[PDB]
């Protein structure tokens, strides 16, 4: 005890995931 | 998210705990501390080898 002693990043993939799911659900519409 | 991140810790240093603060086991210039002059404050100090 003497001695020896002493002493977000996650934005950009939820914004990639959103911008993911628009982009399926406007090719879903382009297909339909 | 960044609130929480704010409130978590606290940005003011830490109060001191007592004689035994861990910047006390090494002093550095950053972090200076000392007593008034010979007298019993510094008695006990050349007393205490620790």
């Keep these: ?32 | 998210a960044n609130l929480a991140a704010f409130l978590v810790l606290d940005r003011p240093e830490e109060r001191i705990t007592g004689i035994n603060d861990p910047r006390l086991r090494n002093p550095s210039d950053k972090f200076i501390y000392a007593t008034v002059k010979q007298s019993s404050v510094d008695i006990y100090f050349r007393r205490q080898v620790e």
């Design chain 1, 1 to 32: 005890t003497l001695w020896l002693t002493g002493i977000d990043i996650d934005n950009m993939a939820g914004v990639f995931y959103m911008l993911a799911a628009a982009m399926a659900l406007s090719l879903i519409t382009f297909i339909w």
